[PDB]
RNA sequence: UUAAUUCCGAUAACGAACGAGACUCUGGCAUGCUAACUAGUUACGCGACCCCGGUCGGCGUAACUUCUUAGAGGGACAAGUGGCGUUCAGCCACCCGAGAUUGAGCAAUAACAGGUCUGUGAUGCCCUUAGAUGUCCGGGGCUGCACGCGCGCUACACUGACUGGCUCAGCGUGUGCCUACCCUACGCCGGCAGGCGCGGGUAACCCGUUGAACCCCAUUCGUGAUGGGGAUCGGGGAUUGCAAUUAUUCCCCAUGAACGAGGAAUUCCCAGUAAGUGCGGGUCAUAAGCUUGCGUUGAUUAAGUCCCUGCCCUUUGUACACA
């Protein structure tokens, strides 16, 4: 029970991401860029997965199915207000984003507002504070 | 050198730069008659005990 | 830091000077006689004067108190 | 009086009145 | 049987506790609960100290209710440990030999005076130019 | 003779929650698996069958003090709204969770929405609560 | 029992002066000021400027 | 128990303060025999009122320090209770006796200070009062256990047990005895 | 008969003399009196800065204003207590006679 | 400088040490066992809870902050 | 000698006045006093539940004022004893006692070219006075960011973070003159911020027994820039408003920066004090990282001095006196 089982997946891979087996599974799957502690715990709930185990001890079929859970939210009865991309301008579909998909959409959205010449995009080009912060005495390590 | 007990008999005056050391007349518990003057840190009371590392050296009275 | 002022000492000395006949060694007896003989507008000052009267008159008995 | 204001506001009202 | 009740109070801070001593068997209760279920459990013996000093034999004849209000946890525990101790002493001064009352009072007041006499300390008022009673804001030169 | 105040109030919630899980006729909502219990919280309950623990807690609070609404239950289950870099403040509990727990304890004949607003405790409930208090006293004796 | 009249402002020139006229027994501190000392302050309009009057 | 007042479950009597000098400023026996470290206080009322506080309460007071733990005496009382359990296991003595020994062994005898012939300056050696001895003894072994526990698996209760065992021994391993010997050395170096 | 006389005043000894006067008047007119129930004093507190400018040390003024409330309940037909309460009025206190 | 890498689960010989050694210690705490076997506090607690329920070590006090066991008596 | 030009002593001074003190408010004490259906308690009758008792902030009316309220007096004075002292003034310790220095308010003669003309329909002179420096209207700015300062908030974790459970406050405030905007219980809807419904309250009456946080108990974590920390950034949703982009505020998911206890230098502070902790008042359509108050948890050190920085006095010297 407490001695290291054979095929203890020390170094797992979930969407080209080197995840640790030594960390507990709920706090281990949050290494992916687009899932936090909140989204991790609710997905490891939705897939009937015992979260008393480490990420070395779970089975490969359970890693596969829970990756299908993470990409497919509404096929497993998860709320629409839980997602990090809700009612997009292009597809109008409320859809969760994972590892590299975030960096894709983030790069697109910054270039988007930059080319349509919104003041928000202009501050993002100048690399200033954009949500209307006072920069008289803040953000100095930014510009040396 | 053997560590020896001096007993405070009469507190005299306060000394140091910032008035930090109590200068006290001690009467030796070992020898009947020998009474010397010693500078002492912290708060000291009339009629209690000190453990002197040397029982020969004496502090300059003011 | 309990030093009595001129008003306490003067008025206490005047009451000892005049009414030595009734004043005593007990605090509460001469507090009442002091209240009766003297018009003191506050109660704290009454207790202060009576308190001094029954300290001087505890020393008049001893010997040559000056004032 | 059906306007029925607080005794607090009533006394500061009387205060400014005299003032 | 007639009335043998004395309502006696114990304050340590804002908090107050009125112990209702009465004739009967040995039971002590605080807001319905008994003594050994009044948290915090850390100060268990603070409620028991009057019991363990006097024994359970002196509380054979009395059944002391306690109603408590105000203050916080530690103040309330110091309020009630004082209240029941005064409540028994006031019972033994009214209905029993004063030699018994005298013996109990001497037993307690030697262990701890805080059992019968209230702590006269109260949270001091704040003054401006400072975050508390005495503390002042940081002064800057140049 | 035993009542609820004679026993340790910590293990009494465990005992009732265990009894109410055994009954298992408690109209438990379907968002239980995905919900956060108050806006001031960061995570979801570590325990997986928390609803029956809160149902036990609500029921014994209606035992001690009757006439409680849901706004009283949002208050009583308040904590620290730890505001990152700004100072901490007090925040209430969730309305929906407290309301549906009271309504689950109403779906079962254990509470009774009394006059002058709020929920009181029903004779069946007080009988239930005092009997399991006797069971808890027996177990710890 | 005692009086105090102090009129301040510019006299005989441009620099501001303060004349104080006082006699008898006058108390300043304590509580008795609230029911022994009657005080009033007024302004007088002259052609060069304002002078202030404090009677006590 | 109308006769003996076991401190939680530790005996009052059969604990002896061997040193004559620190005997008055250490309260463990016969009248300072109380069940809890916790109490009201009023030991900051007058000058030498402090000497009458049970040494266990003095330790409980000194422990709660470094800002974030100012006024958590309940948490400190549970630390002292757990420490007394652990001392009894590893040692097998009366934990109150081990504490009393650690207080004696940790307190310095001589310290360096600035004195006079006012004009220039001079750093000579002077004695420490029997109150100052016990005051600094408590502070040293409290801060020793504190800084040992910081960024470590060894819990504050275990670190306190370590310091009080090694200091009662006179090891030079406890921060208490290490620092004592540093101060007495400097005190010698300029006497 | 059950009639409620409340007295709201900023000054205390004024209010006390009115409370005394209504007990005197009541016990003379031979009617049952409920003694002067003392509701808690309300302290209206306003704390401002002293300086008109802001070029001084930060000193504040603490202005207080106490307001006291007594009430006596009597068992009397309106008339006799109305004529008791129509005499001996001073500027400090204020009267309310409530029937129901 | 230096770093600490404790075990999340027992090596065979580390569990062999635990099954042989930790019931010989006078003080048994998850922190002591964590240092003495190069194991995370989670493993330490789970292992000592096995040892107790098994019926080998005598527990003295439990608390959320501090859980203390000792070696069982001899006679 | 004292907190003190506070006193008693020496004494060509005696007697006094202002400031200190006294004074007003405040905190602690009364089983003594006057009172209570806008405050309770105890007993009682009833009602509900556990096995005669027990619990009830479940219901209801004869006694009383312990707890709450606020009026009148009382009480404490270095008064008792033991020391020290010119034997004085007073200081140290100890009994008894609710206190053996609670904290504020006020505040002298004389002055400063200190601040305010942007508080005033206090106000001299000057300016301007129709294309206004008057005033209204609509837009932006008061926040702009290679930079250097000052006041604060959150952290650097295991004396801890997270998740449950258990349990306790005190100051207040609350529906408006022109003035519109109040405090909210309770029943349904929504995960959440919110929406709709009927109510109480001009307030010891209703929000309310103000179920506050820290703390406490039980778990998960395990020395890893980690479940520490939450800056920066993306997306959606509510509320306030006539209007939020240069995000008002708040909520939900995602992003996870430095920071491993801090150089020279420097600040505040001695008892319910420092500090931790949250709750009210101000501003307020919206609204606290500020400030002004309040309670809860609650110490280490000291009862000393002129070494440091200041200010204050006496002696002495002077060719200074717009010094």
For residue J15, the domain's CATH number is 1.10.10.10
- Interatomic CA distance for residues F50 and F14, integer angstroms: 11
- Interatomic CA distance for residues E41 and J64, integer angstroms: 14
> Residue B8's closest chain H neighbor by CA?
H129
- Per-residue DSSP letter, B24: E
Nearest residue to I81 (alpha-carbon basis) of I7, I15, I12, I5: I5
Collect all residues with Cβ–Cβ distance below 8 Å to E114 and sequence separation of at least 6. Answer: E12, E78, E82, H39, H40
CB contact under 8 A, A79 and F34: yes
- Per-residue DSSP letter, E139: P
- Interatomic CA distance for residues A44 and A63, integer angstroms: 10
CA distances from F40 to A28, A30, F72, F77, F91 (A): 24, 22, 17, 11, 6
Contact E58, E104 (CB under 8 A): yes
Question: Across the strands, what pairs with G40?
Answer: G55
**B6: cis peptide before it, omega within 30°?**
no
Q: Convert F34-53 to b/e letters by CB count within 10 Å (16 or more is b).
A: bbebbebeeebbeeeebbbb
The nt closest to G24 (CA vs C1′) is K17
Q: Find the radius of gyration of the CA atoms of chain D.
A: 9
Where does residue H110 fall: left (phi above 0), alpha (psi -120 to 50 degrees), or beta otherwise? beta
In this structure, the strands spanning I2-9 and I60-75 are antiparallel
J52: containing domain: 4-73
J9–chain A nearest CA distance, Å = 5
CB contact under 8 A, E128 and I57: no
Cβ of J63: how many Cβ atoms within 10 Å?
11
Question: Across the strands, what pairs with A62?
Answer: none
- Interatomic CA distance for residues G1 and G5, integer angstroms: 14
CATH of domain A2-79: 1.10.8.50
> Cα–Cα–Cα angle for C8, C14, C18, nearest 5°?
145
Nearest residue to C52 (alpha-carbon basis) of C17, G30, C41, C63: C17
DSSP labels for chain F? ---GGGS-HHHHHHHHHHHHHHH--S---SGGGT--S-TT-SS--SSSSHHHHHHHHHHHHHHHS-SB-SHHHHHHT-EEE--TTSPPEEE---HHHHHHHHHHHHHTTTEE--SSSSBEE-HHHHHHHHHHHHHHHHHH-
Phi, psi of F3 (to 5 degrees): -135, 180
Which structure tokens are listed for A62?
Answer: 């359970």
For chain A, what are the domain ranges? Answer: 2-79, 80-144
The number of distinct structural domains making up chain I is 1
Residue B42, helix vs strand vs coil: coil
How many Cα atoms within 13 Å fall on the side-chain side of residue C22? 14
The nt closest to I66 (CA vs C1′) is K25
- Interatomic CA distance for residues E74 and E55, integer angstroms: 24
Resolution value in angstroms: 3.4
Contact B38, B23 (CB under 8 A): yes
Contact H89, J27 (CB under 8 A): yes
- Interatomic CA distance for residues A120 and A131, integer angstroms: 8
Surface-to-core class of residue H54, CB atoms within 10 Å of its CB (0-12 exposed, 13-18 middle, 19+ buried): buried
I40: containing domain: 1-100
CATH architecture classification, E1-142? 2-Layer Sandwich (3.30)
Kindly list the residues from chain E whose CB atom is less than 8 angstroms away from the CB atom of residue H8. 45
Residue D15, helix vs strand vs coil: helix
CB contact under 8 A, H82 and J26: no
Surface-to-core class of residue A92, CB atoms within 10 Å of its CB (0-12 exposed, 13-18 middle, 19+ buried): exposed
CB contact under 8 A, A2 and J11: no
Nearest residue to H115 (alpha-carbon basis) of B21, B53, B13: B21
- Interatomic CA distance for residues H73 and H69, integer angstroms: 9
* Chain H residues with a Cβ under 8 Å from any Cβ in chain E: 1-2, 5, 8, 31, 34-36, 38-40, 42, 74, 77-78
The nt closest to A26 (CA vs C1′) is K227
- Interatomic CA distance for residues F88 and F80, integer angstroms: 6
How many Cα atoms within 13 Å fall on the side-chain side of residue H141? 38
DSSP labels for A118-144? -HHHHHHHHT---S----SSS-TTTT-
D11–chain I nearest CA distance, Å = 8
Query: Cα dihedral angle (J34, J39, J42, J48), rounded to 10 degrees?
Result: -60
Nearest residue to H137 (alpha-carbon basis) of H85, H101, H112, H165: H101
For chain H, what are the domain ranges? Answer: 6-189
C-alpha I49 chain-centroid distance: 31
In this structure, the strands spanning I94-98 and I2-9 are antiparallel
Contact H25, H52 (CB under 8 A): no
- Interatomic CA distance for residues F15 and F33, integer angstroms: 23
E2–chain H nearest CA distance, Å = 32
Residue H87, helix vs strand vs coil: helix
Kindly list the residues from chain H whose CB atom is less than 8 angstroms away from the CB atom of residue J61. 82, 85
Task: Write down the CATH superfamily of domain C6-61.
Answer: Ribosomal protein S17 (1.10.60.20)
B59: containing domain: 1-62
Choose among H89, H90, H155: nearest Cβ to J66.
Answer: H155
Nearest residue to C18 (alpha-carbon basis) of C37, C46, C5: C37
The number of distinct structural domains making up chain B is 1
Please report, rounded to whole angstroms, the spatial distance between the CA atom of protein residue E2 and the C1' atom of nucleotide K44: 15
- Interatomic CA distance for residues H18 and I34, integer angstroms: 72
Collect all residues with Cβ–Cβ distance below 8 Å to H109 and sequence separation of at least 6. Answer: B3, B51, B52, B53, H127, H128, H133, H184
C-alpha B19 chain-centroid distance: 16
CB contact under 8 A, I67 and D12: no
- Interatomic CA distance for residues B53 and E1, integer angstroms: 74
Nearest residue to H133 (alpha-carbon basis) of H161, H112, H110: H110
Residue G38, helix vs strand vs coil: coil
**Total number of residues shown for chain F:** 141
The number of distinct structural domains making up chain J is 1
For chain C, what are the domain ranges? Answer: 6-61
Collect all residues with Cβ–Cβ distance below 8 Å to D13 and sequence separation of at least 6. Answer: D5
Which structure tokens are listed for I3?
Answer: 């009639």
Cβ of E7: how many Cβ atoms within 10 Å?
14
Contact E8, E43 (CB under 8 A): no
Contact C57, C49 (CB under 8 A): no
F96–chain A nearest CA distance, Å = 16
- Interatomic CA distance for residues F121 and F127, integer angstroms: 10
- Per-residue DSSP letter, E126: P
Question: Across the strands, what pairs with G9?
Answer: G17
CA distances from H64 to A111, H53, H104, H154, H177 (A): 55, 16, 22, 18, 21
In what helix (H) or strand (E) does residue J14 lie, and over which residues does it extend?
helix J12-20
> From the candidates B5, B30, B40, B48, which should be mutated to test the interface with H, based on the most H CB atoms within 10 A?
B48
CB contact under 8 A, H77 and E42: yes
- Interatomic CA distance for residues C49 and C6, integer angstroms: 11
Residue I36, helix vs strand vs coil: strand
Contact J58, J73 (CB under 8 A): yes
Contact G9, G50 (CB under 8 A): yes
In this complex, does chain H touch chain J, defined as having at least 3 beta-carbon pairs under 8 Å apart?
Answer: yes
For chain E, what are the domain ranges? Answer: 1-142
Q: Which CATH class is domain H6-189?
A: mainly alpha
- Interatomic CA distance for residues A54 and A59, integer angstroms: 11
CB contact under 8 A, A42 and F44: yes
Where does residue G30 fall: left (phi above 0), alpha (psi -120 to 50 degrees), or beta otherwise? left
In this structure, the strands spanning B35-41 and H123-128 are parallel
Which structure tokens are listed for F17?
Answer: 């929650």
Residue G54, helix vs strand vs coil: strand
Q: Is the shortest CB-to-strand distance from F39 to strand K under 7 Å?
A: yes
For residue I81, the domain's CATH number is 3.30.70.600
- Interatomic CA distance for residues A38 and A32, integer angstroms: 13
Surface-to-core class of residue A32, CB atoms within 10 Å of its CB (0-12 exposed, 13-18 middle, 19+ buried): buried
Nearest residue to H128 (alpha-carbon basis) of B43, E119, E12: B43
Residue H143, helix vs strand vs coil: helix
- Interatomic CA distance for residues H54 and H59, integer angstroms: 9
- Interatomic CA distance for residues A69 and A96, integer angstroms: 11
Nearest residue to F65 (alpha-carbon basis) of F118, F101, F109, F13: F118
Surface-to-core class of residue E58, CB atoms within 10 Å of its CB (0-12 exposed, 13-18 middle, 19+ buried): buried
Collect all residues with Cβ–Cβ distance below 8 Å to H189 and sequence separation of at least 6. Answer: none
First to last CA, chain C: 22
H100–chain B nearest CA distance, Å = 18
F6 interface with E at CB cutoff 8 Å: yes
Structure determination technique employed: cryo-EM
Please report, rounded to whole angstroms, the spatial distance between the CA atom of protein residue E42 and the C1' atom of nucleotide K259: 37
The order of strands in the sheet holding I32-49 is I32-49, I60-75, I2-9, I94-98
Alpha helices in chain G (DSSP H): 33-36
> Residue I61's closest chain E neighbor by CA?
E128
Kindly list the residues from chain H whose CB atom is less than 8 angstroms away from the CB atom of residue B50. 21, 127, 129-130
Contact F55, F25 (CB under 8 A): no
Nearest residue to A114 (alpha-carbon basis) of A124, A102, A129: A124
Cβ of A134: how many Cβ atoms within 10 Å?
8
Contact I70, I11 (CB under 8 A): no
Q: Which nucleotides of K are covered by protein (CB under 7 A)?
A: 1-4, 6-10, 16-31, 34-38, 41-43, 48-51, 53-58, 66-72, 74-80, 88-94, 98-111, 113-116, 119, 122-125, 143-177, 184-194, 202-204, 208-209, 211-227, 229-237, 245-248, 251-256, 258, 261, 266-279, 281, 288-307
């Amino acid at each position: 029970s407490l001695v290291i089982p054979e095929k203890f997946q020390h170094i797992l891979r979930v969407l080209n991401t080197n995840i640790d087996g030594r960390r507990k599974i709920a706090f281990a799957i949050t290494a992916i860029k687009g899932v936090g502690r909140r989204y991790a715990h609710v997905v490891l709930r939705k897939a009937d997965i015992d979260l008393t185990k480490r990420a070395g001890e779970l089975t490969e079929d359970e890693v596969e199915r829970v990756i299908t859970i993470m990409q497919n939210p509404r096929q497993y009865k998860i709320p629409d207000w839980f997602l990090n991309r809700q009612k997009d301008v292009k597809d109008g579909k409320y859809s969760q984003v994972l590892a590299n998909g975030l960096d894709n959409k983030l790069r697109e959205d910054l270039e988007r507002l930059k080319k349509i010449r919104a003041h928000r995009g202009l501050r993002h080009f100048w690399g200033l504070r954009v949500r209307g912060q006072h920069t008289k005495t803040t953000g100095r390590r930014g510009r040396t | 050198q053997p560590i020896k007990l001096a007993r405070v008999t009469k507190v005299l005056g306060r000394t140091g730069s910032q008035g930090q050391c109590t200068q006290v007349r001690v009467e030796f518990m070992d020898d009947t008659s020998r009474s010397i003057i010693r500078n002492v840190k912290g708060p000291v009371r009339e009629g209690d005990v000190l453990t002197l590392l040397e029982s020969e050296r004496e502090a300059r009275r003011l | 830091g309990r030093v009595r002022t001129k008003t306490v000492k003067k008025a206490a000395r005047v009451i000892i000077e005049k009414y030595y006949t009734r004043l005593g060694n007990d605090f509460h007896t001469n507090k009442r006689v002091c209240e009766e003989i003297a018009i003191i507008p506050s109660k704290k000052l009454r207790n202060k004067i009576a308190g001094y009267v029954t300290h001087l008159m505890k020393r008049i008995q001893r010997g040559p108190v000056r004032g | 009086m059906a306007v029925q204001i607080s005794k607090k506001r009533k006394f500061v009202a009387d205060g400014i009145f005299k003032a | 049987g007639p009335l043998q009740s004395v309502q006696v109070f114990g304050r340590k801070k804002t908090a107050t506790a009125v112990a209702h001593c009465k004739r009967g068997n040995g039971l002590i209760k605080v807001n319905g609960r008994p003594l050994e279920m009044i948290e915090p459990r850390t100060l268990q013996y603070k409620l028991l100290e009057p019991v363990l000093l006097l024994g359970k034999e002196r509380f054979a004849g009395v059944d002391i209710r306690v109603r408590v209000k105000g203050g916080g946890h530690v103040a309330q525990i110091y309020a009630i440990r004082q209240s029941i101790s005064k409540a028994l002493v006031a019972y033994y001064q009214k209905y029993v030999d004063e030699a018994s009352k005298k013996e109990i009072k001497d037993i307690l007041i030697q262990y701890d005076r805080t059992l019968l006499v209230a702590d006269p300390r109260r949270c001091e008022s704040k003054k401006f130019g400072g975050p508390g009673a005495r503390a002042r804001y940081q002064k800057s030169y140049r | 003779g035993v009542t609820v105040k004679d026993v340790n109030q910590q293990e009494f919630v465990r005992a009732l929650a265990a009894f109410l899980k055994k009954s298992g006729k408690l109209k438990v909502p379907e968002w239980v698996d995905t919900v956060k219990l108050a806006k001031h919280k960061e995570l979801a309950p570590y325990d997986e069958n928390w609803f029956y623990t809160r149902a036990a807690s609500t029921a014994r609070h209606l035992y001690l003090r009757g006439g409680a609404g849901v706004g009283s239950m949002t208050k009583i289950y308040g904590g620290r709204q730890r505001n990152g870099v700004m100072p901490s403040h007090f925040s209430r509990g969730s309305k929906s969770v407290a309301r549906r727990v009271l309504q689950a304890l109403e779906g079962l004949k254990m509470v009774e929405k009394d006059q002058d607003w709020g929920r009181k405790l029903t004779p069946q409930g007080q009988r239930d609560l005092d009997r399991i208090a006797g069971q808890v006293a027996a177990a710890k004796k | 029992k005692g009086c105090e009249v102090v009129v301040s402002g510019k006299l005989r020139g441009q620099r501001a002066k303060s004349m104080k006229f006082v006699d008898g027994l006058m108390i300043h501190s304590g509580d008795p000021v609230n029911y022994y000392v009657d005080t009033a302050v007024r302004h007088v309009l002259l052609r060069q400027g304002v002078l202030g009057i404090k009677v006590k | 128990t109308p006769d003996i007042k076991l401190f939680g479950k530790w005996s009052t009597d059969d604990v002896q303060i061997n040193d004559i000098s620190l005997q008055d400023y250490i309260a463990v026996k016969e009248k300072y025999a109380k069940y809890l470290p916790h109490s009201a206080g009023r030991y900051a009322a007058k000058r030498f009122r402090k000497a009458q506080c049970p040494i266990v309460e003095r330790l409980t007071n000194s422990m709660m320090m470094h800002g974030r733990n100012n006024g958590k005496k309940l948490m400190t009382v549970r630390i002292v209770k757990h420490a007394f359990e652990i001392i009894h296991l590893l040692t097998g003595e009366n934990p109150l006796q081990v504490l009393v020994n650690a207080i004696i062994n940790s307190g310095p005898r001589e310290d360096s200070t600035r004195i006079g012939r006012a004009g220039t300056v001079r750093r000579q050696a002077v004695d420490v009062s029997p109150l100052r001895r016990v005051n600094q003894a408590i502070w040293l072994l409290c801060t020793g256990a504190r800084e040992a526990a910081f960024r470590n698996i060894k819990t504050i209760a275990e670190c306190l047990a370590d310091e009080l065992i090694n200091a009662a021994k006179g090891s030079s391993n406890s921060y208490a005895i290490k620092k004592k010997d540093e101060l007495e050395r400097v005190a010698k170096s300029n006497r | 008969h059950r009639i409620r006389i409340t007295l709201t005043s900023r000054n205390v000894k004024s209010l006390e003399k009115v409370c005394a006067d209504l007990i005197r008047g009541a016990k003379e007119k031979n009617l049952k009196v409920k003694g002067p129930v003392r509701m808690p004093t309300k302290t209206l507190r306003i704390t401002t800065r002293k300086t008109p400018c802001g070029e001084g040390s930060k000193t504040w003024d603490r202005f207080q204003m106490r307001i006291h409330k007594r009430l006596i309940d009597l068992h009397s037909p309106s008339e006799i207590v109305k004529q008791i309460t129509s005499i001996s009025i001073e500027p400090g206190v204020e009267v309310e006679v409530t029937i129901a | 400088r230096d770093k600490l890498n404790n075990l999340v689960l027992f090596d065979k010989a580390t569990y062999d040490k635990l099954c042989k050694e930790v019931p010989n210690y006078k003080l048994i705490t998850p922190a002591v066992v964590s240092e003495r076997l190069k194991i995370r506090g989670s493993l330490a607690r789970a292992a000592l809870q096995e040892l107790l329920s098994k019926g080998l070590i005598k527990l003295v006090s439990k608390h959320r902050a501090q859980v203390i066991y000792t070696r069982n008596t001899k006679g």
